[PDB]
Amino acid sequence: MHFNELRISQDNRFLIIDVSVDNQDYFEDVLLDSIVIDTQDTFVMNGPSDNPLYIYNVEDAYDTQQMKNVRLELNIQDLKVSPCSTMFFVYVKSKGTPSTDTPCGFDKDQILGTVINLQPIYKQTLKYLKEVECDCNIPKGFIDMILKLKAIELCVRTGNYPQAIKYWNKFFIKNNCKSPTSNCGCYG
Amino acid sequence: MHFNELRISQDNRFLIIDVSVDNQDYFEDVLLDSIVIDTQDTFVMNGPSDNPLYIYNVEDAYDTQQMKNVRLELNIQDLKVSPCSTMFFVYVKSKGTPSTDTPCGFDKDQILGTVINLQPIYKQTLKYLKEVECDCNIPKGFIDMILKLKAIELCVRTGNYPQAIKYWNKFFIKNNC
Amino acid sequence: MHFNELRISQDNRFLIIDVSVDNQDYFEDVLLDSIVIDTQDTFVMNGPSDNPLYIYNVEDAYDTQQMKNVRLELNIQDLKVSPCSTMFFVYVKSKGTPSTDTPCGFDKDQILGTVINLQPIYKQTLKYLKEVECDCNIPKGFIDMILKLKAIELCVRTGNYPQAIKYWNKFFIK
Amino acid sequence: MDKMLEISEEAITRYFTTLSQFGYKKYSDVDKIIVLFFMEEMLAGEMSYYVTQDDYRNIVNALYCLAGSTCMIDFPMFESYDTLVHSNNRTFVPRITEDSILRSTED
Amino acid sequence: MDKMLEISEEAITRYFTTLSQFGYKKYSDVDKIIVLFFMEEMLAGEMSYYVTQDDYRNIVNALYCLAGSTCMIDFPMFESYDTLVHSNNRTFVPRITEDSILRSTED
């Protein structure tokens, strides 16, 4: 199993999820069970919390490739959370048994992916961007913002998620952005 | 729409563009229209500039799902530009009306993809690492290059392409590869 | 899989390699595969490098328990390297699947063993002891040599072979 | 444009916010504000018909000197999904282990 | 690699731990942190296809200058069972007090 598109729309409306089982020929019998959305405030070390933010069972739909690829486009206003000061954990639960002879560690029934809105972080980094031009001084703000982002990236891709929330709360929980205008806009 | 792969070939002879349209149930009616290549000299903010480097029309190649996927391998030396010292901008257009159930924000006809050659940066990093191997001191130029690359990355991801051109032309223009 | 003796001959003419597979019951299926020799010039962290110094494939010698134990004696001059100023890296491989009852971490196909010539070090220690005999003062070069040897020991036992070669080339060759 | 208007509105609002908290802004910065709203007026009136694409290029490259110059003028953020190093999501699908005359072969 | 990841995570975590305890880290060491994580993303990205084994040698031998440079970066520990002088566990077993034409013999 893997993630194809894990992103928040830059208009700060939609938490885009697009998961698909891996295409190898041992992964026929493995299907998708459910999608659990969780936040930094309701996180647990192992598996989803018992108080998630949103649950979506895949099998409550057409009943096979339609299962093997799923996409959610949740409106964040419905979830009653801020698109910018919120960091989401997307758990995807599998339903089935991979055929034997697979190399071990590919038969992971659960996969987890972290989501953040980088646009306000780029807004903060653009402030210190021009320090790169000036010589004779260290671009201290630019380096600080780069290290702040890289800490969260590193702590996510290593699985050290709790320290990732600690850094996120320290740094970016006070991020501000323009809330999506609920009345839709004319453009194209 | 989106990009599948967008890079310069490892042989420094081709500029690869592979475009595909999103698989969405509301993008059946959307196809691909054209591919426009611009450099840091002709780039303009409001869409592709006039007198572009290379205009490509997709209905010439094919004789409907073929229209939804396009791949190119443009010999850069035919474009009459330096593969090392050029910053290609690749625009793509849709020529299609998505469905009425399209979520707000996804009905963007145009996209943009920036391209640079990574060999010169690689060779510069190897030179700086070789300097580091002597006396285990980091040259300040190495940190400067890293942070200038980060600045160009931030400018590109934020859409501030003119200042990215400024930084590129000022700092990284003289490149050996 | 382990080493029985990995030594350079006292005559400074042969490089002795005597490998064996462990005696525990669940390496019955496992055999010995090959012997790859690298120096301080051609080493790479990720296994043996390309263009190695000397490759050896063990089916060639024999015509199955004979294949579990191997002994080599390479004339170092035939390898076209200096026996006194060369640090050899000796890789070995298994080409065999252990049973399913193996305790975790024991199933590793590859090992490595570093080799150097102790004769020059012995001569340096004898020279420094001769210096000590005169006036009973410890030369500081002797303590430096001792501590640098201990540094290379620590680097080898921790697996930090790059800095190990750096120290070797910087101190015990030049 | 519709964005120079937003940038100018933000800039003068910040200017008068500073003049509310403080009673002083650098006139070297008021000069940049003046340049900014003069360009906003000129491009959004009857004077834009003299603008070529070279003129547009020069105008944009001159305006971006004002971008991070002060706190009032700030770097604009546009909707972009690109980067200097794009991803490779192509998949490999071999056919009947078939090498071609020289190269390998997929679907 | 999977280890440059661990070293980079450790280094930046130590950096921010120092900025939590103190309010200052030498920028001569922030330079080393920058070089380290820049190298790791260089080697775990789309630019890992341009490296030969000589380039790998040079990169490793240049990164080992950062090993004990500061407390943030440490000497990595690998699983090793070797040493500069090995033990001789071979055993001696002659055949009924025999010898060859010149020397001794065993089983």
Binding site: - | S9 | - | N88, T91, F92, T105, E106 | -
Partner: peptide
């Protein structure tokens, strides 16, 4: 000598540059 999914991904991305489809004959 164990390979993870990522290593196989690198192998795919290298091999894709060398191979082409039926249409490209």
């Amino acid at each position: 000598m164990f390979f993870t999914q990522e290593d196989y991904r690198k192998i795919e991305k290298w091999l894709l540059a060398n191979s082409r489809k039926d249409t490209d004959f």
